[PDB]
Scaffold this active site. Structure first.
Site, PDB file in Angstrom:
ATOM      1  CD  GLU B 117      -2.862  -0.877  -0.177  1.00 23.74           C
ATOM      2  OE1 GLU B 117      -3.570  -1.841  -0.520  1.00 23.74           O
ATOM      3  OE2 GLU B 117      -2.782   0.177  -0.854  1.00 23.74           O
ATOM      4  CG  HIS B 141      -4.637   1.018   5.740  1.00 23.94           C
ATOM      5  ND1 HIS B 141      -5.968   1.365   5.637  1.00 23.94           N
ATOM      6  CD2 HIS B 141      -4.536  -0.246   5.259  1.00 23.94           C
ATOM      7  CE1 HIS B 141      -6.644   0.354   5.117  1.00 23.94           C
ATOM      8  NE2 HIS B 141      -5.799  -0.634   4.882  1.00 23.94           N
ATOM      9  CG  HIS B 143      -8.046  -3.724   7.778  1.00 24.73           C
ATOM     10  ND1 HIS B 143      -7.839  -4.938   7.162  1.00 24.73           N
ATOM     11  CD2 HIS B 143      -7.379  -2.809   7.037  1.00 24.73           C
ATOM     12  CE1 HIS B 143      -7.079  -4.769   6.099  1.00 24.73           C
ATOM     13  NE2 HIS B 143      -6.784  -3.485   6.001  1.00 24.73           N
ATOM     14  CD  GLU B 171     -14.145  12.609  21.547  1.00 23.88           C
ATOM     15  OE1 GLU B 171     -15.268  12.847  22.071  1.00 23.88           O
ATOM     16  OE2 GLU B 171     -13.577  11.511  21.625  1.00 23.88           O
ATOM     17  CG  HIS B 212      -9.645  -2.175   2.322  1.00 25.89           C
ATOM     18  ND1 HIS B 212      -8.962  -2.325   1.133  1.00 25.89           N
ATOM     19  CD2 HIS B 212      -8.750  -2.432   3.303  1.00 25.89           C
ATOM     20  CE1 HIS B 212      -7.710  -2.660   1.383  1.00 25.89           C
ATOM     21  NE2 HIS B 212      -7.555  -2.729   2.691  1.00 25.89           N
TER      22      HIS B 212
END
Ligand SMILES: [Zn+2]
Ligand SMILES: [Zn+2]
Ligand SMILES: [Zn+2]
Ligand SMILES: [Zn+2]
Ligand SMILES: [Zn+2]
Ligand SMILES: [Zn+2]
Ligand SMILES: [Zn+2]
Ligand SMILES: [Zn+2]
Ligand SMILES: [Zn+2]
Ligand SMILES: [Zn+2]
Ligand SMILES: [Zn+2]
Ligand SMILES: [Zn+2]
EC number: 4.1.2.19
Lengths: 274, 274, 274, 274
Positions: B117, B141, B143, B171, B212
């Site tokens: 990625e 990144h 999941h 918040e 994803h």
């Protein structure tokens, strides 16, 4: 080398059973793990071996596994205690030359025996060996909560479960392109469920036992744990989604196909319905 | 200094990947992290460097990142093992002078390579650098379960997701006033998804990949982790709320506006619908 | 004594913020904790004090807290890092003789300041001091997930929330017989929300900020943590119950009354509706 | 031997209370555990005993437990702190020769007393002793979240709860073939709830207190913890299933019967309805 508990395989078994336990997948004695070893893996630890290895018959002859050593979890043993006492909860067993029984060379102290699910494990190891030309070496069983819950709501069909799980997390089709096999409910700890499990394993690296749990196969502990974890993660997403009323959008069949092509895998075609 | 594993950046990477794993966000190899470093950060550890740094081409030329060093997670590497073996799961890479490739100066042993990625990471680092005049240094990144589940039920639109997430925890508007960008589903690990991600990053510090996961940007590991954690926390509240049948009351548009004014932020206007 | 980080109060703050974080209640900087100390608690550690204590004005004069020392969490500081660096995430502050400001005698390094929710904390400490004749010493705020989710579905009324929470776990009426106060949503970090919180505290040891979180008061860190934990546990049961469609049976008003009598407490009467 | 905290029983109590706490079953002082010991277990640690054991009367005479030593959790004590200070949260008590009271031989410092649920514990230990001819030695109570939630939705009947729990995880019928007893809600900490609990224990190793929690009995800490954990695991599956709308398929009565036969157990017949 030194103490076998410090070997790569016992350490791996401890890490795997511990992570699973921490995942909430293996309460009590629910769950089991077996890793196929080479004689060369255990040879450095001959002095740790039992001098009078107990011999135990197999439920049925398994000639292809003749002379094969494995490290397995024990019957009625808790994944949670493996880290506390490896030798009492883990055992290295070696199948005899006829594949009619095995000797416990190390561990499984206090007269402990391997998991009562050994038939499912060993028979599956057999098929996975043939299916992957000896690459797979681990069969893992755990009571992954969400996957279990899904078996009461989703149609218990390989195509259905494979497709929904592929939809529940993008990487799923890439991690298990061969899909997820599913059996009808069967009495556990029998040669029958074991054989039925092995059959699914000819194609699927993941097999579900409705209202019970999941079986996974892989080349290493990490990959096998990761495989099950990926399936349970997707199952977890699906449960939340179904609990919110269902999907409004999802990964499409064409997207799933583009995904397979991109990563060079051939996804189970019968799961590319719709 | 001494061993690079003890540096602030490797320790930070270990803490971040570990916390995420413990969060249940990074099963298997799901997830990736990259932190932009200065040559001065890695210089104290020259003796830890590989003597024959492997060179790897980039998917596409990225001239603005020329000569830039980064510490990244590896392809197919588990966030869970980073703490166990930093060097095998983490690598410090340095983009060459043309921004056409990078040398692995440390880590990523056993011929490991950076996350597939990387295009999404590097391209996004690029935009965030321009968007924040060099303040942002981390692209993460993961999941995040609840955020993923929500992408199957909520309309996949930036305004919708931003507004609901702002409503799910007070918040939120203050932590990500610029909102949450969302992309259509795309094949991961491609230059296309990476570029689409970078585009959203021109404004949003958080970007969702439906079905994803999530991408986040920030000045430090702590702030970037905290950003994603805040969004996933709100997502978690929303899933429970939707599971109970939906909201009967919520933070109003005027309250959201008063909140923004009080903390001196300019909230994404298009998310202040209703 | 020796290092202040090893004192009963810093150790207590570390344990409390850590457990809360592990509970998933304090992502990022969400949440804050303040414990009122006696000069005698901090006196053994004079040599650990800052030689040039920074002085910070209070939002509004609080004369009853004049000369009072407290250990608090910092503004923008993560509960998660307290255990890693107490001094950077925790600070001991002492209110001046007019209760118009306070000096940071220890901690809150790198120019850190106390939580922006200090008004809610200090004003509430004030009321709790009067309400319990000096017994309460802790005010804790956390973003308890389930309690937050419930504020979007349950009528935001003290009687409603108190009653449902009492019903969600038997011991609740015994742990917080005075019930749970609830405020309308308000801009956080203001004197207004702080004063509104203190008002509820005259009677309730627990106060909810809809779509935001919970505030709790108690004599010790353990009791205050336990109070919030009991409320969040009940909230967790309720969310599951509402998610399954609602209650078919529950603890009755008469049973709740018998419970109060048995443990010698006077339950909030207005919550004994029905 | 040496320090009693290092004995198999104190270590076992610490492990059990810790795991339960980590399970999210014992917030605050919710929950209690008692393990019956032999004089021979505690004899090696005579020098650790209190020289002036405090004597406490029992709620009611329990002659069968006369002269019996037990290690128990304290009243108002948190399972979470047991590992931090065993002696303050645990106590070894010995019932006097008439079974009219007990002496605290060790622990329960600061004038702490055993759990206010001691009647339920001791009375149940009594019945379990008779039911298993002295094999059972542990009575454990915990506030298992999912089991609690289920008591508000499922008909509070032994047959109903037993059957659904058996259906929620295959091994359940094998782990608790005698089923799960359930009481009407009652005021906790009374001789009445204790006696009602003991009555159910004549047959069931698991007993539910609606809107409150669960009681379990077993020969060892591990087996008793595992029993409750298995029931809570099944409860967890059921909550997800009910939250998704209910079961479409499940383990059938005939399958449940085949399961019982295979493992040589006689399942509670009245739960084999349908
Ligand atoms: Zn199970
Ligand atoms: Zn199983
Ligand atoms: Zn040999
Ligand atoms: Zn994933
Ligand atoms: Zn991903
Ligand atoms: Zn150099
Ligand atoms: Zn929050
Ligand atoms: Zn807050
Ligand atoms: Zn002084
Ligand atoms: Zn409780
Ligand atoms: Zn209880
Ligand atoms: Zn003696």
């Amino acid at each position: 080398m030194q103490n076998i508990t410090q070997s790569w395989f016992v350490q791996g078994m401890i890490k795997a059973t511990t992570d699973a336990w921490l995942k909430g997948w293996d309460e009590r004695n629910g769950g089991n793990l077996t890793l196929r070893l080479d004689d060369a893996d255990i040879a450095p630890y001959h002095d740790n071996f039992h001098q009078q290895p107990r011999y135990i018959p197999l439920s049925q002859p398994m000639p292809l596994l003749a002379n094969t050593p494995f490290i397995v979890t024990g019957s009625g043993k808790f994944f949670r205690n493996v880290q506390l006492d490896p030798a009492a909860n883990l055992g290295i067993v070696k199948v005899d030359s006829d594949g009619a029984g095995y000797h416990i060379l190390w561990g499984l102290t206090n007269e402990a025996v391997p998991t009562s699910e050994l038939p499912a494990h060993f028979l599956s190891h057999c098929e996975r060996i043939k299916a992957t030309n000896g690459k797979d070496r681990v069969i893992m069983h755990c009571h992954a909560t969400n996957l279990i819950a899904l078996t009461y709501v989703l149609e218990n069909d390989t195509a259905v479960f494979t497709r929904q799980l592929w939809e529940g997390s993008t990487e799923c089709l890439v991690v298990f392109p061969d899909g997820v096999g599913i059996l009808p409910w069967m009495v556990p700890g029998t040669d029958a469920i074991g054989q039925a499990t092995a059959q699914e394993m000819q194609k699927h690296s993941l097999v579900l036992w409705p209202f019970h749990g999941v079986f996974g196969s892989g080349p290493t502990l990490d990959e096998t744990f990761g495989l099950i974890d990926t399936a349970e993660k997707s199952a977890q997403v699906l449960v939340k989604v179904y609990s919110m009323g269902g999907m409004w959008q999802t990964i499409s069949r064409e997207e799933l196909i583009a995904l397979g092509k991109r990563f060079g895998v051939t996804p189970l075609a019968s799961a590319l319905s719709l």
